[PDB]
Amino acid sequence: NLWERFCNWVTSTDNRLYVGWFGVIMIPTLLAATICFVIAFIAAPPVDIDGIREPVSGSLLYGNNIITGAVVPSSNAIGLHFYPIWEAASLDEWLYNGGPYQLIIFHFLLGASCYMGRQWELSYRLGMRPWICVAYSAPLASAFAVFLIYPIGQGSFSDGMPLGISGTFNFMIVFQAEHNILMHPFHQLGVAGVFGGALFCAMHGSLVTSSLIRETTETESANYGYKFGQEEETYNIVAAHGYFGRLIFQYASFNNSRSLHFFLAAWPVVGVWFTALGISTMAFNLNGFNFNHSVIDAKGNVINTWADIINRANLGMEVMHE
Amino acid sequence: VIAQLTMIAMIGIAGPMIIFLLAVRRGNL
Amino acid sequence: DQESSGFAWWAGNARLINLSGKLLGAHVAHAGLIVFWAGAMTLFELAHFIPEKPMYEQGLILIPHIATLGWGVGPGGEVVDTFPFFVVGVVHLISSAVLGFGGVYHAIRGPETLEEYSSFFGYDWKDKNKMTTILGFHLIVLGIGALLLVAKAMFFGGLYDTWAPGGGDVRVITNPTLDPRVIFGYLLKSPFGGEGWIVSVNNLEDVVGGHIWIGLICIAGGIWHILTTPFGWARRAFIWSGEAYLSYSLGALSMMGFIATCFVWFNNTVYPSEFYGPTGPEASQAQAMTFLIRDQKLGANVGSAQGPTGLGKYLMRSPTGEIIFGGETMRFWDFRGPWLEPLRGPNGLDLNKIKNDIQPWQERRAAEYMTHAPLGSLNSVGGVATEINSVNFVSPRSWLATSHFVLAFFFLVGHLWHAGRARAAAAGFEKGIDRESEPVLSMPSL
Amino acid sequence: PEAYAIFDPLVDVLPVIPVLFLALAFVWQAAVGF
Amino acid sequence: WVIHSITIPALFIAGWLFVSTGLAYDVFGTPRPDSYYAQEQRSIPLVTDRFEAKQQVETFLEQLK
Amino acid sequence: METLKITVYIVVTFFVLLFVFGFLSGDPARNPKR
Amino acid sequence: MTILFQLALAALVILSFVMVIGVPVAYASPQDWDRSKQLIFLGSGLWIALVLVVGVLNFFVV
Amino acid sequence: METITYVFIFACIIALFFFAIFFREPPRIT
Amino acid sequence: TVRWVAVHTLAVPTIFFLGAIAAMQFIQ
Amino acid sequence: MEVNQLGLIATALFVLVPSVFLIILYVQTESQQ
Amino acid sequence: TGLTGNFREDTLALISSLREAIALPENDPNKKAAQAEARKKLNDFFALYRRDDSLRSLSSFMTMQTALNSLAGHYSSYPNRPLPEKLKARLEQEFKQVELALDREAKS
Ligand code: CLA
Ligand code: CLA
Ligand code: CLA
Ligand code: CLA
Ligand code: HEM
Ligand SMILES: CC1=C(/C=C/C(C)=C/C=C/C(C)=C/C=C/C=C(C)/C=C/C=C(C)/C=C/C2=C(C)CCCC2(C)C)C(C)(C)CCC1
Ligand SMILES: CC1=C(/C=C/C(C)=C/C=C/C(C)=C/C=C/C=C(C)/C=C/C=C(C)/C=C/C2=C(C)CCCC2(C)C)C(C)(C)CCC1
Ligand SMILES: CC1=C(/C=C/C(C)=C/C=C/C(C)=C/C=C/C=C(C)/C=C/C=C(C)/C=C/C2=C(C)CCCC2(C)C)C(C)(C)CCC1
Ligand SMILES: CC1=C(/C=C/C(C)=C/C=C/C(C)=C/C=C/C=C(C)/C=C/C=C(C)/C=C/C2=C(C)CCCC2(C)C)C(C)(C)CCC1
Ligand SMILES: CCCCCCCCCCCCO[C@@H]1O[C@H](CO)[C@@H](O[C@H]2O[C@H](CO)[C@@H](O)[C@H](O)[C@H]2O)[C@H](O)[C@H]1O
Ligand SMILES: [Ca+2]
Ligand SMILES: [Cl-]
Ligand SMILES: [Fe+2]
DSSP states (O other), rough: HHHHHHHHHHSSSOOOOOOHHHHHHHHHHHHHHHHHHHHHHSOOOOOOOSSSSSSSOOTTTTTTTTTOOOOOOOOTTTTOOOOOTSSSSSHHHHHTTTTHHHHHHHHHHHHHHHHHHHHHHTTTTTOOOOEEEEEETTHHHHHHHIIIIHHHHHHHHGGGEEEEEEHHHHHHHHHHHHHGGGGGGHHHHHHHHHHHHHHHHHHHHHHHHHOOOOOOOOOSOTTOOOOHHHHHSSSOOOHHHHHHHHHSSSSSSOOOOOHHHHHHHHHHHHHHHHHHHHHHHHHHOOOOOOOSSOOOTTTSSOOOOOHHHHHHHHHHHHHHHH | OHHHHHHHHHTHHHHHHHHHHHHHHTOOO | OTTTTTTOOOGGGGGTTOHHHHHHHHHHHHHHHHHHHHHHHHHHHHHOSSSSSTTGGGOOOOOHHHHHTTOOOOOOGGOOOHHHHHHHHHHHHHHHHHHHHHHHHTTSSSSSSSHHHHHTTTOOOTTTSSHHHHHHHHHHHHHHHHHHHHIIISSSSBBSSSSSSSSOOBBOOOOOOOOTTTTTHHHHOOTTTTTTTSSSSSSSHHHHHHHHHHHHHHHHHHHHHHOOOOHHHHHSSOOHHHHHHHHHHHHHHHHHHHHHHHHHSSSSSSHHHHHHHHOOHHHHHHHHHHHHHHHHHHOOOOOOOOOOSSOOSSEEEEEESSSEEGGGGOOOOSOOTTHHHBBBSSBBBBBBHHHHHHHHHHHHHHHHHHHHSEEEEEEOOOSSSSSOSSSSOHHHHHHHHHHHHHHHHHHHHHHHHHHHHHHHHHTTTTOOOSSSSSSSTOOOOO | TTTTTHHHHHSSTTTTTTHHHHHHHHHHHHTOOO | OOOOGGGGHHHHHHHHHHHTTTTHHHHOOOOOOOOOHHHHOOOOOOOOOTTTHHHHHHHHHOOOO | OOHHHHHHHHHHHHHHHHHHHHHHHTTTTTOOOO | HOOOOHHHHHHHHHHHHHHHHHHHHHHHHHHTHHHHHHHHHHHHHHHHHHHHHHHHHHHOOO | HHHHHHHHHHHHHHHHHHHHHHOOOOOOOO | OHHHHHHHHHHHHHHHHHHHHHHHHHHH | OOOOOHHHHHHHHHHHHHHHHHHHHHHHHHHOO | OOOOOOHHHHHHHHHHHHEEEOOOTSSOOOSSHHHHHHHHHHHHHHHHHHHOSSSTTSSEEEEEEEHHHHHHHHHHHSSSOOOOOOHHHHHHHHHHHHHHHHHHHTTO
């Protein structure tokens, strides 16, 4: 049969790139996102955020370094309405109101989701415990949060992330103005989640590189001695254990690699989830507690603790934006 | 408060108590 | 038991997979908590509750629900007698006292496995029949309550009204709307801007007439499943097994969350803006009008005008025939609230009419929604986002949508977690790759 | 209600105790000892 | 199990007093809850230059209202 | 414009249609073991 | 006479709160668990009635 | 001038990707 | 000996600051 | 638009010279017997 | 109410009750209870017409909504006091426009 044979080809593992059934969505959508991205990034008519005044050129053709160039999000005039090509009156109308933004993020997200599964439905067919797709939820949580969700809290994709290296910076700062994200606890964990990720990434990277059973000569590269498929243990635990076990007290050294590596992958992930929760907590205007006039004298004067400085800086920004 | 606070402290300390009595009993777990 | 037969302790619940006698003990106990939590908050809120002021002012996430069914509300959202609110909570407590008691009974002295004491109650996860039999009964029972809502709607008392010709409060529906034209075709609407998917529900009587179907659909479901048995195409997919059942439950339960997140945040019809606090879109909306009237009141005509931004000071003409508010509010021209719509004319707002047709409640209420525009902090520092230490609140409407979302998010992960472990378990290699023969070891090498 | 007017701590904290069950599980593990 | 019913209580009460006694005030020179702005003259008693501050901190503190 | 509308529908409808049957036909049957 | 009833009201919790301890402990040591203890059937059937005094009386009381 | 360098630089990236995915020397076992 | 010197010279001041923490919260 | 006139050579040398230096080493390795 | 058929006939029909019930004797056996049950029809009335998306566009329907919201809205706040005359007269002047403007739709 053609189908039964075709179905066998999609699922088949012999491909240099595995396309599972999720790949049937993933591949065309992303390949459609990128094509409509790089082009729109290079040539974007000066997309207008507000039909009142000010067209914004984030396109690359107009005088923009990679740094400054970005795809402008959709206008406020368009609001949150689903705004495809055909619904828009004219093609140039669809670009001038910031169509290509609303086009990319949909195909991107709906592409990003199916990717999260495509990692799964490969893992199921190689006969291996499938938790990667859990770990991958952490970015994908952040994706939906900043792209899809947060504008719903604002009711317009305009406040969504302009995608670009300057656009992103503009986003945070303005986002910092309104919601005071720094003082928010969920973010304050996300920092820990990222650092301790990078931190542990250094140690668990270091300690094992530190301990290498030597198959190499001093002149030769140290790496090449590892033979792909060695069933020897390439790194002594007993040696590296006592190392960290002497450096600090011997109690905390995490004897078990299977115990370690999990904790290695729990810390960054769980750290990130809170952020994508921290945003969604903000999108609904539930903000980071800003302690203000926490101190006052008997005379009613304001002793003006630090947070006020931040409270002022934000109060400074918001006026600037509008 | 304090009267109320005392009332709360007294009102639900069956958790630990339950386990301790059960532990003494060497019942089942 | 211990880990010897099982797995480790931190995960230790799933030791229950094969013990049904213990399994009922879990749920009935767990359901006991949920019930007990329900009445607790009720009384907890009722003690700190102030009947005079509005509900959303109180930081009150529950009593609005009870009220929304029209008990003790009164017209004007008066919140007349609190005693019906009191009865609800305490009853759930007493109900929990029974539940957990049973939950304990199955937890310990109840038989450790049900395959014997009652064969009827006995079930094997892998069995695709006696289990589906159970799926019927609940789907029947869960369908009963849906009707039992309508029993409140059509018969006993009457449910809340968002839109009344005045006061927007209490009505007993007479004729519910039912037909596939506006019901099945209802959910066929776009999810996106300007048309809610299920979040539109303009008329109250939609939900009642709608639940009738969901009432009479589910009753068919049980009768369908009770009298049927999975077909071939069903059997080839779905991985019948203890985990997967839980895995499917999540996905459904997850998507429910995002929907529940959507209602509370947008829909005014089901959750009346009155005692749930104004919807985010309505907030800036109403505020925009109070500025309008206060200036239009005194020596100024705002109808034909320009602003410093160029769009006009208040009113604009949308690309549609209707004319709307300006400012940031223009991003919401779709909102129709109980107070605003009558002020609106055939196309957009009728300016001449706006001045005259204001009511005593509207303007007052529309201004009452100015102070509360959903905002705030975790310590509840309120007012406009950077407004400094004034009017400190977080509108309960913002809490639910936040809360249920976060939970609903996890259940997506949860679904995507067990579905992995469910199938891999059925696939048998969930235990880890096999060192004897690696599936990858012998394959065509690209 | 006034007939119920005073049980201050009980009505003050009902809702915390559901959390306590989760805590109980650990103590009920502590004696069992993992 | 022996002196750990003695050390801790007698020691912990010390810290209780230095706040209550306010001894920590003039030890660490923190302002007192009423003491910031002497007279009214609402301004920052900001210490300025070097080889002074020991004498300059006196001035701000000297007034004290 | 309008032609594009129906086109996107047809194309999107096609993949999603092609997509479900993959699972609706014997997907667990495709795996190293059973 | 709400005081007459408020004392009986608290008598519910007092009797309940002990059965909160008693019932699990009754199952704790299976020795003479169901053998020695019929008090459940003695306490429970008496406990349920202590619920009905609450509302039906208070409906008239308050 | 300005832009045309970026596209060039960005092009060779892609020309690396497609090139680095398919043409890598397979790391055989043993 | 060695171990004792660690905690004694560390956790002791901790107990002494806990005085400052608590005894503060009742000021003002 | 106006630009640093010589800035273009910067990229080219910064692209090619490090690039080339990697090729030359590589092509050698390919020739190793 | 007893509303049936299309909007038009009933819309006209309700005004027969509306314009009448505005000014009656307060000292009659029941004006209130009569005015009570008469305005309850508004509830019945304006619930079903909210459902219509068609008439939600044109004037003549949204005219009536302006009238309905004007009249009935008084009765939640303080229904006991009769309306101000200035609010009473404006109602008829709205109805008078309506059935004419209402008729303007059909025979447009
Ligand atoms: C967030 C995306 C996502 C991902 C990656 C997965 C991943 C998985 N699901 Mg799944 N699921 C999800 C969301 C997701 N779920 C939701 C929201 C529901 C609603 C209840 C379900 C309901 C569900 C069931 C009922 C079953 C799975 C199953 C599975 C497994 C693969 C089999 C399969 O085809 O899945 C099903 C895939 C889908 C339902 C597709 C929904 C999301 C994809 C990514 C979008 C595809 C396009 C979509 C139709 C929209 C495009 C067109 C649209 C405009 C109309 C795998 C673990 C199976 C399983 O493991 O059972 C043991 C299974 O039987 N899922
Ligand atoms: C519908 C609800 C539901 C149910 C009944 C189950 C049932 C089960 N799950 Mg499970 N799960 C669910 C949803 C559900 N899951 C969701 C949504 C997720 C994603 C988060 C997971 C993720 C998950 C994992 C990762 C694992 C399970 C496992 C299990 C099995 C053992 C239970 C267990 O590990 O308890 C364990 C109980 C504890 C560890 C104690 C709770 C401690 C956490 C940290 C509480 C923190 C929450 C709290 C609000 C935050 C702190 C409070 C704050 C104030 C500081 C059992 C079959 C285990 C398994 O292997 O399955 C076979 C397992 O490893 N589940
Ligand atoms: C909150 C939900 C919940 C529920 C209903 C259960 C229920 C259960 N768990 Mg469990 N568990 C939970 C959460 C929960 N768990 C969490 C969060 C974790 C991770 C920390 C675990 C970890 C865990 C492990 C590791 C194991 C269980 C096991 C069990 C089962 C037997 C336990 C046992 O021997 O009890 C005996 C209990 C006692 C001897 C004393 C308990 C204290 C009593 C019941 C207090 C009474 C409650 C209240 C005060 C009185 C209400 C009644 C009143 C009206 C009279 C039981 C069905 C075991 C199992 O596999 O099942 C056989 C097991 O090995 N659980
Ligand atoms: C929650 C309750 C519930 C549950 C768990 C089940 C579960 C099941 N039913 Mg079922 N059923 C129910 C209620 C329920 N039913 C009700 C109320 C009715 C009406 C009387 C039926 C009528 C019914 C029939 C007639 C049959 C089943 C069958 C089945 C079995 C496999 C089919 C299936 O699940 O479809 C899974 C879903 C699909 C295969 C296709 C999904 C198509 C959906 C509807 C898309 C709709 C468009 C959607 C809005 C797009 C949005 C995109 C999305 C991302 C949101 C399965 C065990 C079959 C079976 O085995 O019975 C012998 C069967 O033949 N059911
Ligand atoms: C003035 C303060 C204290 C004195 C004089 C004191 C006294 C002592 C002495 C003499 C010992 C060693 C002899 C023995 O173990 O019996 C000891 C051991 C110990 N005490 Fe204290 N104690 C003080 C405070 C504390 C505090 C604040 C702690 C907090 C945990 C503490 C905990 C311990 C511990 C852990 C040891 C074991 C030392 C080791 O294992 O090396 N003591 N104490
Ligand atoms: C009273 C009362 C009642 C009852 C209730 C109950 C009975 C409850 C329970 C309770 C509970 C249920 C409790 C529990 C307990 C717990 C606790 C007390 C906790 C604490 C904590 C802990 C102890 C933890 C531990 C730990 C740590 C500390 C660290 C490390 C880790 C761990 C986790 C181990 C009622 C309803 C009748 C009402 C009236 C009154
Ligand atoms: C088994 C088990 C478990 C679980 C537990 C549970 C789940 C429990 C539940 C519990 C519950 C679920 C409970 C319920 C009960 C209830 C009760 C006990 C109640 C009490 C109270 C009352 C009776 C009330 C009274 C009153 C009135 C009537 C009026 C007003 C005043 C008052 C409020 C006082 C765990 C895991 C931990 C561990 C293992 C074993
Ligand atoms: C209207 C309305 C209403 C009613 C309700 C209803 C009527 C609903 C329905 C709904 C529904 C009734 C839904 C459904 C949906 C669908 C879905 C969501 C399902 C699930 C399933 C599925 C999705 C499947 C899956 C799959 C796939 C996809 C592929 C292959 C494989 C499988 C089969 C697994 C109310 C009253 C509330 C309100 C108003 C409006
Ligand atoms: C007036 C009043 C009152 C009284 C009331 C009463 C009279 C109560 C009732 C309550 C109730 C009324 C309860 C009863 C009980 C019930 C229950 C809680 C049930 C459940 C159970 C179950 C559900 C079981 C299960 C099962 C089985 C075992 C077999 C077959 C199936 C079934 C599922 C059925 C009070 C005191 C609150 C106070 C306030 C006022
Ligand atoms: C998969 C990869 C796909 C990549 C697709 C894109 C590849 C196409 C590359 C063609 C690039 C043409 O590069 C083109 O250079 C000229 C001048 O150098 C730029 O033009 C620039 O200078 C001219 C004057 O010289 C100005 O009038 C113009 O406004 C300014 O932008 C164009 O803005 C840029 O588009
Ligand atoms: Ca209090
Ligand atoms: Cl009056
Ligand atoms: Fe590593």
